[PDB]
Write a protein that binds this ligand. Structure first.
Ligand code: HEM
Ligand code: HEM
Lengths: 298, 296
């Protein structure tokens, strides 16, 4: 059994919290374990909320656990240079929630960490929201080729072993340059993305440097697929863009797409990265519900 | 006719923007005048959105109008002493929106303002949201005694004259100190607010220093009423609290309440201000739809 946030389709609103554990590690772990029980209680008090949660830990923080770390779990490596850079964030824990209402997300975080506020530093706290008809602020629909129904389970979740039901996670908070992106016309923007803007139909000739051209990778030969839970975020006068987050049964897919996007593989960078920049970056592993409740410090 | 955001009840989501005008005043004003048409168009394209808008101007910016300022419109004065202080924010325009969805609030602001972003500096941009069962983040329900239905029109809107249909506006962004508020027990919090916490029942004895005690003012009268469109805002790790915004036919009600709260009237300050602090304070006047389009 995976954690409730991973498999279902993303709700209209989402919470993505990155935090660092400074002290009282045992108290913090307990508080994190008690999140599912809190969420269940909220759902019982609030029909239609469909509140979900997934707690994940970084490679560095996993050392504190008695349970052995996932085979592929590593630190998020920095990629690229200058205007095409993928920063690495010092973070121990990811808290991911999504629901049909925004307020319960704030409540879940406030109530959930109330006792461990002084033990924790929240590195980043992003509230995502569905934008129009599932569109990114770039005007293009996001999630068109995102796995659906049954194949979500076999793409996101580890199939076998001790970590079965668990999932590898990546997150990158992107900040958009909307005016620069606005300069390009419809056809040009479609060349950057690789799909049509109004109906998200894949172009007959997908440019290799286009975003889809960068991330549509098959090497098996079978497509490297991930389950994305990303959602637009931010304000007009401040940071705004996309909180990218994805789950996968293997971290290899993340690494391949990122190395392809940031010019490690081909030497060519993603055209989309001309109009957006990653400000955070981290790898995690979200264990099954059982393992999460069985995790203990050493 | 008033502006669409004032009279109806506040939606589950709201946008509150304070901004200052750098230059190109003529074609910052025109862009602001175009906002109602934009909101209506969004409402047509998005049924059920119930998107609304209200544009208001401060006393400082009303100098640019050939039209004279409302008789009661003043610069927001600094009030209080000690921890209890009411800061004054130099701002030209207020853009107030609320709807049944959040995404259209960002869409409305980005669309309506980005063209004049070169001429405009956003002083504050706050996204409010109704929290649980209409509760403030202190755990107390907000809006229990807020005017309803037929009362809203007579409380918020100017009845007569040239400025009829318009409304005086006040805005204050509050920052809550929740852990300090958390140290107090249930009874102490209720005495500070002036009502019971779970069901917002007014205390038989409302202390003069309590928040209700400060704002429940009698002038014979004896009921000074305002229409509050306030809504909780913010993040856990950052600023969070209440974006207070209120409409009224007279600015006198705002000034009287604020004088009472910050220990100017009697010398006693609002007990609630021990746990929250205003970081923004401003007065406006939202013109009627007619005056709005003819302001020059
Ligand atoms: C940063 C790492 C990212 C990765 C690893 C990633 C991954 C993917 C994948 C696997 C697909 C589907 C490919 C296919 O068609 O088979 C996709 C599509 C797409 N992504 Fe990304 N993405 C990233 C960032 C972004 C950003 C920052 C944006 C927007 C600002 C974005 C917007 C889109 C759009 C518009 C599509 C096409 C429609 C769709 O199938 O969802 N992506 N991405
Ligand atoms: C952090 C700031 C504030 C908080 C948390 C707060 C909270 C509350 C609460 C819980 C109530 C009782 C429920 C209700 O009747 O709505 C109330 C009442 C009220 N408040 Fe506030 N308030 C704040 C600021 C203000 C300010 C600055 C003003 C005026 C300048 C104001 C004016 C009023 C009025 C007119 C009432 C109705 C009292 C009555 O007639 O029973 N509030 N407030």
């Amino acid at each position: 059994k995976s954690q409730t946030a991973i498999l279902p389709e993303a709700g209209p609103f989402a919470l993505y919290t990155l935090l660092k554990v400074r002290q009282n590690h045992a108290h913090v772990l307990q508080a994190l374990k008690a999140l599912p029980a809190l969420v269940e209680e909220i759902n019982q008090n609030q029909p239609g909320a469909e509140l979900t949660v997934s707690v994940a830990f970084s490679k560095g923080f996993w050392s504190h656990f008695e349970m052995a770390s996932p085979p592929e779990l590593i630190d998020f490596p920095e990629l690229g240079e200058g205007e095409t850079h993928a920063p690495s964030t010092d973070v121990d824990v990811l808290i991911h929630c999504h629901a049909t209402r925004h307020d319960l997300l704030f409540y879940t975080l406030r109530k959930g960490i109330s006792d461990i506020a002084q033990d924790i530093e929240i590195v980043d706290e992003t509230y995502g929201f569905r934008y129009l008809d599932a569109r990114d602020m770039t005007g293009f629909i996001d999630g068109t080729e995102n796995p659906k129904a049954e194949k979500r389970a076999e793409v996101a979740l580890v199939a076998d072993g001790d970590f079965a039901g668990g999932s590898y996670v990546m997150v990158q908070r992107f900040v958009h340059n909307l005016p620069a992106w606005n300069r390009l016309n419809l056809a040009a923007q479609e060349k950057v993305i690789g799909r049509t803007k109004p109906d998200s139909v894949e172009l007959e000739n997908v440019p290799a440097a286009s975003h889809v051209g960068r991330v549509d990778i098959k090497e098996e030969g079978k497509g490297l697929k991930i389950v994305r839970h990303s959602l637009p975020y931010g304000s007009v006068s401040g940071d705004h863009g996309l909180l990218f987050i994805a789950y996968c049964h293997t971290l290899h897919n993340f690494k391949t797409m990122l190395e392809s996007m940031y010019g490690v593989t081909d030497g060519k960078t993603d055209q989309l990265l001309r109009f957006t920049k990653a400000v955070t970056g981290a790898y995690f592993f979200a264990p099954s519900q059982v393992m999460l409740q069985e995790l203990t410090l050493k």
